Structure formats: structure tokens, C-alpha cells
Design an enzyme around this catalytic site. Structure first.
Site, mmCIF file in Angstrom:
data_model
loop_
_atom_site.group_PDB
_atom_site.id
_atom_site.type_symbol
_atom_site.label_atom_id
_atom_site.label_comp_id
_atom_site.label_asym_id
_atom_site.label_seq_id
_atom_site.Cartn_x
_atom_site.Cartn_y
_atom_site.Cartn_z
ATOM 1 N N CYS A 82 -13.705 50.545 81.657
ATOM 2 C CA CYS A 82 -13.561 51.893 81.547
ATOM 3 C C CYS A 82 -14.974 52.636 81.583
ATOM 4 O O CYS A 82 -15.870 52.319 81.214
ATOM 5 C CB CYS A 82 -12.845 52.425 80.390
ATOM 6 S SG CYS A 82 -11.288 51.690 79.903
ATOM 7 N N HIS A 118 -10.979 58.576 75.320
ATOM 8 C CA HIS A 118 -10.522 57.620 74.641
ATOM 9 C C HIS A 118 -11.602 56.571 73.697
ATOM 10 O O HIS A 118 -11.251 55.829 73.056
ATOM 11 C CB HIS A 118 -9.348 56.690 75.120
ATOM 12 C CG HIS A 118 -9.760 55.751 76.282
ATOM 13 N ND1 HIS A 118 -10.633 54.904 75.885
ATOM 14 C CD2 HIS A 118 -9.486 55.828 77.445
ATOM 15 C CE1 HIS A 118 -10.759 54.110 77.133
ATOM 16 N NE2 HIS A 118 -10.028 54.693 78.232
ATOM 17 N N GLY A 129 -13.414 46.379 79.187
ATOM 18 C CA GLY A 129 -14.557 46.860 79.298
ATOM 19 C C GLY A 129 -14.951 47.639 80.373
ATOM 20 O O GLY A 129 -16.271 48.154 80.454
HETATM 21 O O1 LIG Z 1 -10.538 47.483 78.613
HETATM 22 C C1 LIG Z 1 -9.738 48.407 79.205
HETATM 23 C C2 LIG Z 1 -9.055 47.958 80.439
HETATM 24 C C3 LIG Z 1 -9.452 48.496 81.585
HETATM 25 N N1 LIG Z 1 -8.895 48.234 82.979
HETATM 26 C C4 LIG Z 1 -8.318 47.124 82.943
HETATM 27 C C5 LIG Z 1 -8.170 46.355 81.836
HETATM 28 BR BR1 LIG Z 1 -7.302 44.424 82.196
HETATM 29 C C6 LIG Z 1 -8.379 46.494 80.520
HETATM 30 N N2 LIG Z 1 -9.186 49.373 78.561
HETATM 31 C C7 LIG Z 1 -9.658 49.808 77.252
HETATM 32 C C8 LIG Z 1 -8.572 50.215 76.375
HETATM 33 N N3 LIG Z 1 -7.772 51.169 76.889
HETATM 34 C C9 LIG Z 1 -6.567 51.502 75.872
HETATM 35 C C10 LIG Z 1 -7.099 51.974 74.586
HETATM 36 C C11 LIG Z 1 -8.057 52.802 74.554
HETATM 37 C C12 LIG Z 1 -8.669 53.260 73.318
HETATM 38 C C13 LIG Z 1 -8.438 52.640 72.304
HETATM 39 C C14 LIG Z 1 -7.328 51.758 72.378
HETATM 40 C C15 LIG Z 1 -6.814 51.402 73.209
HETATM 41 C C16 LIG Z 1 -5.725 52.703 76.460
HETATM 42 C C17 LIG Z 1 -6.215 53.684 77.224
HETATM 43 C C18 LIG Z 1 -5.389 54.573 77.662
HETATM 44 C C19 LIG Z 1 -4.080 54.595 77.499
HETATM 45 CL CL1 LIG Z 1 -3.089 55.661 78.198
HETATM 46 C C20 LIG Z 1 -3.615 53.580 76.742
HETATM 47 C C21 LIG Z 1 -4.305 52.431 76.044
HETATM 48 C C22 LIG Z 1 -7.139 50.301 78.032
HETATM 49 C C23 LIG Z 1 -7.724 49.938 79.103
#
Ligand SMILES: *O=C(*)(*)(*)(C1(*)(*)(*)=C(*)(*)N(*)(*)=C(*)(*)C(*)(*)(*)(Br*)=C1(*)*)N1(*)(*)(*)C(*)(*)[C@@](*)(*)N(*)(*)(C(*)(*)(C2(*)(*)=[C@@](*)(*)[C]=[C@](*)(*)C(*)=C2*)C2(*)(*)(*)=C(*)C(*)=C(*)(*)(Cl*)[C@](*)(*)=[C@]2(*)*)[C](*)[C@@]1(*)*
Ligand SMILES: *O=C(*)(*)(*)(C1(*)(*)(*)=C(*)(*)N(*)(*)=C(*)(*)C(*)(*)(*)(Br*)=C1(*)*)N1(*)(*)(*)C(*)(*)[C@](*)(*)N(*)(*)(C(*)(*)(C2(*)(*)=[C@](*)(*)[C@@](*)(*)=C(*)(*)(*)[C@@](*)(*)=[C@]2(*)*)C2(*)(*)(*)=C(*)(*)[C@@](*)(*)=C(Cl*)C(*)=C2*)[C@@](*)(*)[C@@]1(*)*
Lengths: 305, 306
Positions: free
Chosen positions: A145, A41, A143
């Protein structure tokens, strides 16, 4: 003595964390050999996430639309591809600190260490368990991820989790490093929710064994219970039923402490029915369920890496 | 969201852990630049430990009586000296993995990460707090001496603890890296014990803020109080006094919740006077005091509050 919620040493993993930027989005990626792995993503805009066509979104990207930074060093992207819910960025430099590693899909009840990262930079490390409802109860902000979870199996880093999002009820969902989600969750904005969770009974029993090993045994009683009678009490308190495989897994800890497993079950049953009476066990004012039996033996015997 | 006891990443410290051997004893040392730090009781025998003359024992020892191993590499000892209760071994090689670092002495209530090591190699990492009685509640087995505690700020490691021994109640005692023991504990065989402990009030308040931020709000009442009145309550219930500096440090948490610091104090006062009625806060049936305000800000504030 003493028994703590202990994470693996993270050094081998810290050297793999990089920053990945696409458009206005910055998150974390995992740099192993000449490939960088990150949640797919990262290529979406807020509009796409209602109903994304990820293949179509990826065809419109070019290599130069991906900016990858290892500390202060920019890594040149030379290829991009999708595998399930993970993006794979091929870079012109092999990570010289790639540890021995493998990719593993874990099962509910199993534990791992999470290296929480922001902007490619590791911030903290803590233990988690894969919950029966295929979520984890972690600590993650915007932030985060691309943060990864792992075990060390002797000399090999076993990656098992990559963070993808937080569900509305406050639990966290992600994938294995093949890019497949744990549980029924999807990387798009829908009406998905986690099922009801349960307490991991065999892990609570292992932690009670850890307490006895370390001299904290006020909760041991003189009663006996059968397996069937324990499980009916357990299920009323939203604990999972104890199987014969669970009983057998606790054999070694039962032998070391001299407390029969069903005797421990009788002690747990009274803790559930009467509470802990303002007392702690191993410093905890609750029944901890995120130590596996193997975690207990690893910590109590001083295994190093 | 979420709230977990979180340690600092341990890699910068892993690259500094070595194995130190003297006679039949093996423990851990910390290798920074061309110096290895470790507990000075490594030079003792069981009989020495009843009444150790460390000055005389150290004169007896020569450089070649110390074996230092970094992985599979032997480091040559070219000098040795003592600073309070830590031994400093000069080696002929500077550690190429030395981070930017400093030695700091922390105060009760402050937290730090511990890297538990055996034979120069790491077992795991967890968070600890300096108790008001100058002990910590760690996880340390035979051979863990010389394991260190630390905080990391950007790229700088602040070392604050070196592990020396376990006390009778299963709590742990050690020094800063200048060899000065936390508390009145000594490195000799003695009938020592940890004094009575107290609860770290500013940490409990930080934790109650974390609970509110994570949706646990049942304990909030409509009352306020004053610092003076709240400190009378704290004193009656074996809690540390609360200072204006503590109120200032809690500011970011008050701003994210909209609950004034003294309003939170009044809610804590009601919990202390009336109990919790069997309810949990963040899963716990007792109030928790091992999270500092900085620890909670690190996990909850993000870019919005400072
Ligand atoms: O930054 C973030 C976070 C992680 N862990 C915990 C918290 Br409290 C926060 N993130 C990033 C953003 N994401 C969303 C999006 C993506 C791309 C473009 C726009 C928005 C999502 C993912 C997956 C699904 Cl199944 C739904 C939505 C959230 C997480
Ligand atoms: O190892 C050890 C330990 C730590 N922690 C925990 C445990 Br379970 C264990 N260690 C070592 C030994 N030490 C002793 C002492 C110290 C201080 C004081 C007293 C005693 C010793 C030392 C030296 C010698 Cl020679 C002998 C003994 C303890 C700790």
C-alpha cells in the site's frame, strides 16, 4: 526494432518513496516538498476497518505516533491532516530530490507505470492500464500500500495512482493523489466488488499497428468491414465498441503504416473469431490491450526523459 | 496477488548513462568511477566495418577524438584502451553517482532489466531473458548501442549486458561488460544469424507455479514422473534439460502450492504431449519461458516462503 511492455524510467520517483509506520502497520508514502502522502487506513486497527470513523481515529493520533524513514534517515513529523482517503504528514525537511510534478486523475483506458514498493524501498516497475471497471491488474503483495503510479509528461512527473487494497477477485483499487478512489470503492471492509471488465479495443488496435511497424504482420487480411459491423462482433467478445474519437486517435499510426483503421478492424475481427492459431504477435500469445496509441508512438520514436 | 513482467527500478543505472561521440557516431556509454564503457564499434566507419582492424583503428584514435557528455557537462578523456569488444575511456572525473556494482556474465534462461537509452538519456525499462541461442528480444532503435542490462540485489547493481547490434530476425546481440559477446556473434559486417532456439524448461515450470498461485489450475493432473523420464520428453519437444539444481530452486514454489516439483513436471509433460485444448494460462495461449524461479518467488512468496 522490437516492441516491449516498457515502463518509464523510475529514478525521479524512487527518490520520493519513504516508509511510514503507525502502530504495528508499515506501508509506503510519497515524499514531495515537505509533505508525505500515504493511504489513510495506515491509522486503523483491524477492528476499526469494519466501520471506521477516520476523523475520530485521527484526532486520537499525535505527530509522534507517525514514524517516517527515508532510507536510514528518520524524518520528524510536525503536522498531520486528512484529504479524502489520503493522509498528509508534514515533515521538517523538504525532499531535496522532489522532481517537477503534478497530480492527475486519469481515465479508463489510459496507461501508467507502477513503482511497486515495500517498506519504503522500491522493488520493481511495470506498466498498467486503468481498466473500464476502474480497477488495475497489477502485482501487489502485503505491504505494498502506498505504491504509486505515474507518467512522465516531457519534464514533469504526473502522479495518477496510489495503491490502497486488493479486491477479493484479485484486481487492485486505489486513489488519485487527491485521495479520491477510482471507481465506487471505499477504504473499509464491505461487500464491494468490481463490475465486469471489458477489453480496451482502441489499445488492441494500437498494438496491432505497433506490430506492423516492427515487421510482424501475418494477421493482416484483404477484407473490409464497416464500423457498425465491427462493433457488433466486438461487443460479442466483450470488447468495448469503437467510437469515432477512437478511429481519429489512430489516424497517425494508420498514416505511418498505410493500413486503414477499418482494415485493421477487419483483421482484429478475424483474430477474435478464429484465434491466433498458435502464433504470436510481438512475442505475445494473446491480444494485448495495455498500450495506448500514444504509448506506441513514444516507444517507436525513442522519446527520452 | 497478480503476476506481471516486472523490471528493477532504473534510478541507480540512470545516473551512470553518458553520451559518447567519435567522429559522426553518437551512442551511449556507462560511466562508473573514472571509466566510461561503450561498444568498440564506435570508432569505426561504414567501410571499416567490413574488415575492421580494431587494434590499428584504436592506435589511430587519440583521446581528443572522443567526446563524452554527462548531461550538459563534458568529461575530459585522458586515456583509452580496449577489452575484447568494449572500449574503456579513462576520464578526469569519477562519477559521483556510481552505485555499488559488479560485472557478471549470465547464462541462458536468466533474466535482467534493460534501460533503453538514446544520446545518453533513458527512454524506458523492461525485462529480458537470455535465450538459449544467446540473443535477447528487446526494443532497440538506431542509437541504442551501449544501453545496458542489469539486476539489482539490495543496493548492488550487477551489470550483465551491453547492447551492440540487431540480428536479421529482429533479435538482439551484445556483450557482457568485459566485452565478451554472448554467443558467437562478432562486431563486423558478416552474414551472421541466430541459431535455432529452445524453450527454457525450468522457467516454464516457474510460470506454471505462478499460475496456480494466482488461481489458474485447470492443467494440473494426478500423475507424477521422474527427472530422467521428463528429460526424454523435454528433449523430444525442443526444451532445455532439467537438472536437480533446477528442482531445488523451485522448492519455495512447490511449498506454497503443495505441488511437488515432479508432479508439476508430469503436468507439463501432459501439456506437451496433448496440447492446451485452446485454454489459456495467465491469459496466454502458449507456455511462457521468460520468468525465472527467482522472478516468481519475488512476486508471489512474500515473507512466508524463501
Ligand atoms: O497489504 C495489503 C495488500 C495490498 N495489496 C495486495 C495485497 Br495481497 C495486500 N493491504 C493492507 C491491508 N488492507 C486492509 C486493512 C487496512 C488497514 C487495517 C487493516 C486492514 C484493507 C484496506 C482497505 C479496505 Cl477497503 C479493506 C481492507 C488491505 C491491503
Ligand atoms: O544503432 C544501432 C542499432 C542497434 N540496435 C537496433 C537498431 Br534498429 C540499431 N546500431 C549501430 C550501427 N551498428 C552497425 C553494426 C554493428 C555491428 C556489426 C555490424 C554493423 C555499425 C557499427 C559501426 C559502424 Cl561505423 C557502422 C555500422 C548496428 C547497431
Amino acid at each position: 526494432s522490437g516492441f516491449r511492455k516498457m515502463a518509464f524510467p523510475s529514478g525521479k520517483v524512487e527518490g520520493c518513496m519513504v516508509q511510514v509506520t503507525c502502530g504495528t502497520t508499515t506501508l509506503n508514502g510519497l515524499w514531495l516538498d515537505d509533505v508525505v502522502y500515504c493511504p489513510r487506513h495506515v491509522i486503523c486497527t483491524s477492528e476499526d476497518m469494519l466501520n471506521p470513523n477516520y476523523e475520530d481515529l485521527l484526532i486520537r493520533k499525535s505527530n509522534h505516533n507517525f514514524l517516517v524513514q527515508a532510507g536510514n534517515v528518520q524524518l520528524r513529523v510536525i503536522g498531520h491532516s486528512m484529504q479524502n482517503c489520503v493522509l498528509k504528514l508534514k515533515v521538517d525537511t523538504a525532499n531535496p530530490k522532489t522532481p517537477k510534478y503534478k497530480f492527475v486523475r486519469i481515465q479508463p483506458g489510459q496507461t501508467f507505470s507502477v513503482l511497486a514498493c515495500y517498506n519504503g524501498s522500491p522493488s520493481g516497475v511495470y506498466q498498467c492500464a486503468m481498466r473500464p471497471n476502474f480497477t488495475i491488474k497489477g502485482s501487489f503483495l502485503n505491504g505494498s500500500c502506498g505504491s504509486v503510479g505515474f507518467n512522465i509528461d516531457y519534464d514533469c512527473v504526473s502522479f495518477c495512482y496510489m495503491h490502497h487494497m486488493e479486491l477479493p477477485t484479485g484486481v487492485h483499487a486505489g486513489t488519485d493523489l487527491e485521495g479520491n478512489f477510482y471507481g465506487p470503492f471505499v477504504d473499509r471492509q464491505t461487500a464491494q466488488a468490481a463490475g465486469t471488465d471489458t477489453t480496451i479495443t482502441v489499445n488492441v488496435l494500437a498494438w496491432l499497428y505497433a506490430a506492423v511497424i516492427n515487421g510482424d504482420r501475418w494477421f493482416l487480411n484483404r477484407f473490409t468491414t464497416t464500423l457498425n459491423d465491427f462493433n457488433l462482433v466486438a461487443m460479442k467478445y466483450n470488447y468495448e465498441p469503437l467510437t469515432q474519437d477512437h478511429v481519429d486517435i489512430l489516424g497517425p499510426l494508420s498514416a505511418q503504416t498505410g493500413i486503414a483503421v477499418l482494415d485493421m478492424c477487419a483483421s482484429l475481427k478475424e483474430l477474435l473469431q478464429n484465434g491466433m492459431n498458435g502464433r504470436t504477435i510481438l512475442g505475445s500469445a494473446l491480444l494485448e490491450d495495455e498500450f495506448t496509441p500514444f504509448d506506441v508512438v513514444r516507444q517507436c520514436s525513442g522519446v527520452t526523459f
